[PDB]
């Protein structure tokens, strides 16, 4: 008769597996409304690890606390003004921290009470990966709506999702998440050395890359939030589950007792880096944004235009146009129609190659992703805590720092520009993003080699 208890903890785990999938998708939308540089979205994201460090039947209370955290995460939107077509993001930060609190006694006490009473971890993690695809599809459905929906006639909106300034309804994501957490809290109230470095220098890459994959697929390739969301949701997550299952299937398929698992970890890492260094050869050439990379006339890299030197237009505001030739100018003052110049069909076709390479990379990672815990008692806890703390808090911070080192035009808000980046010099974007990722991967690989040697 424990099956009801099992279903209760399953509904508990669904909320935790939904949380990150929600936050890292909301990060791109909550950067343009509060108009904050991309170095503080790192801190907002790291707040969720900050709370977990701070807090480091009863297993159910955390679910209601998380519902509270998510509802407080969305509460700023109701009690606030309108976003043009502040020191207020604090709530969001506080909110996220609250979330982390609930996350503390939920995951471990589950297995703890599970091993005492009466495979269970197996079936639980099997039914675990559901929430991610649910959340990815919800994000694909909500990244189609505005930010102040229910309060403005959508037809009077002029921005489009392919445009830069557009921001969706993230508060609804947090709201549905918190409501699900509250509901999942309802039943429990009635129910009764070198290896840590090796793994850190690999997990930091994954967390940063997930935090900024949408920034990449939106500024080098022409893919909005909805398409890239549902394409990872429908495709990449079932294959991730297939890899996680094949991990345990392989452990039984061949006896990888001690040297076998080491060889397998080296193998999965090498296959990862082998299928991950191909993003360079799928690279589409950068777009032409005059006045920021190339001068108004001629092709060379603030020497104002000869034609615009006479006109007394105003710098520092993004409202673009698309010349018939394929060059985008900053605003009609400086010079076809309102919008930008989308890339040729070449990049739109290359995006599917990007998708296939991403699927294959996540796959070849998922094989060792499960064997890692098999390889390594309190040391498990120390490794877990260290990777969580350092990766979570530090990855989006340094990633955002460098990505902010490559941002041509910014926005001004009454002072101190520090406005959300509204155009990226795409080649520098590729260099920085892929370079940090690849250098970190190889830094982990050399440690793998040293370990398997010893």
């Amino acid at each position, epitope marked *: 008769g424990l099956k009801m208890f099992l279903a209760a903890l399953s509904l508990s785990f669904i909320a935790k597996t939904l949380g990150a999938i929600i936050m890292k998708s909301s990060i791109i939308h909550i950067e343009r409304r509060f108009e904050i540089s991309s170095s503080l979205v790192g801190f907002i994201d790291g707040s969720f690890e900050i709370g977990n460090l701070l807090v480091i039947k009863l297993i159910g209370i955390g679910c209601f606390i998380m519902g509270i955290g998510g509802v407080l995460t969305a509460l700023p939107h109701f009690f606030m003004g309108y976003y043009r077509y502040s020191y207020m993001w604090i709530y969001v930060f506080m909110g996220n921290m609250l979330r982390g609190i609930g996350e503390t006694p939920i995951v471990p006490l589950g297995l703890s009470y599970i091993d005492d009473f009466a495979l269970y971890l197996g079936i639980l993690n099997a039914i675990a990966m559901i929430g991610p695809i649910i959340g990815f599809t919800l994000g694909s459905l909500f990244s189609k709506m505005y930010v102040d929906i*229910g*309060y403005v*006639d959508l*037809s*009077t909106i002029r921005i489009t999702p392919t445009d830069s300034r557009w921001v969706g309804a993230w508060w609804l994501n947090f709201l549905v998440s918190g409501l699900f957490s509250i509901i999942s809290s309802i039943p429990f109230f009635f129910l009764p050395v070198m290896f840590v470095l090796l793994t850190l220098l690999q997990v930091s890459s994954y967390i940063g890359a997930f935090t900024y994959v949408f920034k990449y697929v939106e500024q080098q390739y022409g893919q909005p939030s909805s398409k890239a969301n549902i394409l990872l949701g429908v495709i990449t997550i079932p294959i991730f589950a297939s890899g996680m299952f094949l991990g345990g299937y392989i452990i039984k398929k061949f006896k990888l007792n001690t040297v076998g698992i080491a060889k397998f970890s080296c193998f999965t890492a090498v296959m990862s880096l082998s299928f991950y260094l191909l993003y360079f050869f799928i690279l589409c050439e950068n777009k032409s944004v005059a006045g920021l990379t190339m001068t108004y006339d001629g092709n060379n890299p603030v020497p104002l235009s000869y034609c615009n030197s006479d006109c007394n237009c105003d710098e520092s505001q993004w409202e673009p146009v698309c010349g018939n030739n394929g060059i985008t100018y900053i605003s009609p003052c400086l010079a076809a129609h309102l919008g930008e110049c989308p890339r040729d069909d070449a990049c739109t076709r290359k995006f599917y190659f990007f998708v296939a390479i991403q699927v294959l990379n996540l796959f070849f990672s998922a094989l060792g992703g499960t064997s890692h815990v098999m390889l390594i008692s309190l040391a498990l806890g120390f490794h877990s805590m260290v990777i969580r703390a350092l990766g979570g808090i530090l990855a989006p911070i340094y990633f955002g720092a460098l990505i902010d080192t490559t941002c041509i035009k910014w926005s001004t808000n009454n002072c101190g520009t520090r406005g959300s980046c509204r155009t990226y010099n795409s080649t520098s974007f590729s260099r920085v993003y892929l370079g940090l990722s690849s250098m970190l991967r190889v830094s982990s690989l050399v440690l793998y080699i040293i370990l398997i040697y010893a």
Partner: antibody
Amino acid sequence: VQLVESGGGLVQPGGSLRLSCAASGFNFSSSSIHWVRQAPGKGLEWVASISSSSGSTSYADSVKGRFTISADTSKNTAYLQMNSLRAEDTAVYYCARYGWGGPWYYWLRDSRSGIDYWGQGTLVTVSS
Amino acid sequence: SDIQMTQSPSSLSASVGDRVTITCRASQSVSSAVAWYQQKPGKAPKLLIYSASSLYSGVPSRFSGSRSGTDFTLTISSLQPEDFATYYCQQSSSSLITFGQGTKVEI
């Protein structure tokens, strides 16, 4: 965005007639088109309604029946076919849409009230 | 139903920058679904206020509508030269509409 009515003339007392209203810019299906009348130098009044693709015919307790309100959803048109306009129907008929109501978080307690967009209309006066 | 609406004033003589208080009365079945329109000669009416509190996006912020008991009211905060027209108070419920005889302001 724009709603234009066409048809209407000086039909002799008795007989029938039909007026059409075309509109594009909004989903022509999910927009409760309404007909409203204004006699020469007098107040306004309501005539009929087609809430959606569904008929949902509803009329006025003074000239009910003699009118029929239909719609060609494929041809994005609203039709009002009238019979035996005797003397009181002389007016300047107007098409209209129930505009997007106020903020849809707390205006579900109150029903739909506003009327956003209006056509210029043309007379359907009737006399001998 | 049998929803009616009456409009007591018929010719007002407010001056520039005043607080005219045009008031309609709900005869039967107060529905809290009123709407106030404005009409100039030989033109098509526009929406000033709907549900007696909110406004139409584009309308000057002077116009203030309010609900009290059974007699809704419309106060023009301060008149202007582009305001002297006819004002209509309409009531609507579940696909039945009723209108009013209109207040005509003048000087």
